[PDB]
């Protein structure tokens, strides 16, 4: 499977942009994320819609909506996509560092993400579970246009590439690919095709 793998991993990017496109679709459809220590009657759930323009972030303290995203003006429909320094994960979240009233327990260690903007304002938010935590980190990193930090993302990458190459190998049944590519038969220096072009 040597040239097989060479070809498979070598034709990477199409699946990559496909997965990233799906991630943007996911951020756009979004959901109600989670706040910090929203216990004494606080809307822990609150929708965070990425624009179909993928530039504004329709997020803010929306109600305990079980339906999730509701298309309207959130509290702050804008998070500047360009200036986001990064998102801190786990202990790097200063809200995870908080040990007072907003002390997040160790059971949300992987749900802690703070989106960096204004260099003094943070988005200390919580995911409902790890997989979509990684999903939204992947989505913002697609906004960052970089690698993806979801385990599920590599899962989908490898599996879909596997099926694609697996369906690719249909025309080449009962054939071997020499690991050294077959020698290109010499092209005669004349391009005066005896039979016409097209």
């Amino acid at each position: 499977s040597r040239p097989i793998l060479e070809l498979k991993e070598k034709i990477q990017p199409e699946i990559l942009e496909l997965i990233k496109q799906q991630r943007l679709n996911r951020l756009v459809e979004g959901t109600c994320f989670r706040k910090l220590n929203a216990r004494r009657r606080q809307d822990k759930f609150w929708y965070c819609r990425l624009s179909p323009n993928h530039k504004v972030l329709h997020y803010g303290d929306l109600e305990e909506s079980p339906q999730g995203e509701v298309p309207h003006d959130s509290l702050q429909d804008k998070l500047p996509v360009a200036d986001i320094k990064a998102v801190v994960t786990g202990k790097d979240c200063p809200h995870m560092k908080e040990k007072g009233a907003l002390k997040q327990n160790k059971e949300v260690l992987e749900l802690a993400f703070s989106i960096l903007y204004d260099s003094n304002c943070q988005l200390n938010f919580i995911a409902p579970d790890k997989h979509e935590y990684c999903i939204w980190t992947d989505g913002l990193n697609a906004l960052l246009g970089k690698d993806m930090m979801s385990d599920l993302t590599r899962n989908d990458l490898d599996t879909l590439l596997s099926m694609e190459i697996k369906l690719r190998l249909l025309d080449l049944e009962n054939i071997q690919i020499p690991d050294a590519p077959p020698p290109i038969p010499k092209e005669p220096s004349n391009y005066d095709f005896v039979y016409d072009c097209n």
Binding site: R168, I177, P181, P185
Partner: protein, 269 residues
């Protein structure tokens, strides 16, 4: 390059690996890029591709795996068995459409039915590969044909895709404008299988006995497999174990008694 020739014994324009960009009309041709070569050179081949049947590409013979066979598997008698190889080509095209809709699936929140489409896709591809060989006995040929036809038509039906007919031999003889009423009832049998499967997702996926009753309504003889492991008793003498089926309601036995000799040492004689 010169001396190109028109021919139709190259329909399987076959790559080897992702081709070099050596020609101005060639790219890293996919492994599954069956291309319609129009013009034939000895060591080279240029013509249409499945990727773009309106465009040429000069492909090496050392890269072209020549297959004189064409879309018809019997004119050159390429059939490992006649009337079947069609089936693989249209199911492969069907697989292309499953790939397209697969793209349509992940990008949407159909991931449950999408995942079940994944698993039937994998069953389809493994059946495809196993029937690539002609080693099967003809009964199993028919069995695989019908089961995969049901699966692919199921794939069509939750995807609302159009219907096919001619259950046997490539699903194509009927759409060859042979009759009308036989065509009508072919469509009717198709709809009948449609209703069968649409009523049976709720019958099997959720329930575990309707499938059993439907299976038991098709055959009339059965057998119970008993795999004895060890006898737990304290006799110390030879024991002759008469085990069989009994009808307590009728106070009678139902199967002949299977005599088992159990030894005096606790382990069967």
């Amino acid at each position: 390059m010169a001396r190109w020739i028109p021919t139709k014994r190259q329909k399987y324009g076959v790559a080897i690996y992702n081709y070099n960009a050596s020609q101005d009309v060639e790219l890293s041709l996919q492994i599954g890029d069956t291309v319609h070569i129009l013009e034939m050179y000895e060591g080279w081949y240029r013509g249409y591709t499945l990727q773009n049947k309106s465009k040429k590409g000069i492909f090496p013979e050392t890269y072209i795996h020549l297959k004189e066979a064409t879309v018809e598997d019997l004119g050159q008698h390429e059939t490992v068995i006649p009337g079947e190889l069609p089936l693989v080509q249209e199911l492969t095209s069907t697989l292309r459409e499953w790939a397209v809709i697969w793209r349509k699936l992940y990008v949407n929140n159909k991931l449950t039915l999408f995942r079940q489409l994944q698993q039937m896709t994998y069953s389809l591809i493994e059946w495809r590969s196993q029937i690539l060989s002609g080693t099967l006995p003809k009964d199993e040929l028919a069995e695989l044909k019908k089961k995969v036809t049901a699966k692919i038509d199921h794939g069509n039906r939750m995807l609302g895709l159009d219907l096919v007919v001619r259950d046997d031999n490539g699903n194509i003889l009927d759409p060859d404008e042979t009759s009308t009423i036989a065509l009508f009832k072919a469509h009717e049998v198709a709809s009948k299988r449609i209703e069968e499967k649409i009523q049976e997702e709720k019958s099997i996926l959720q329930n575990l006995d309707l499938r059993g009753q439907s299976i038991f309504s098709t055959i009339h003889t059965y057998g119970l497999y008993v795999n004895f492991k060890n006898f737990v008793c304290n006799i110390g003498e030879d024991a002759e174990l008469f085990m069989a089926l009994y009808d307590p309601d009728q106070s009678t036995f139902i199967s002949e008694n299977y005599l088992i000799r159990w030894g005096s040492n606790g382990m069967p004689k």
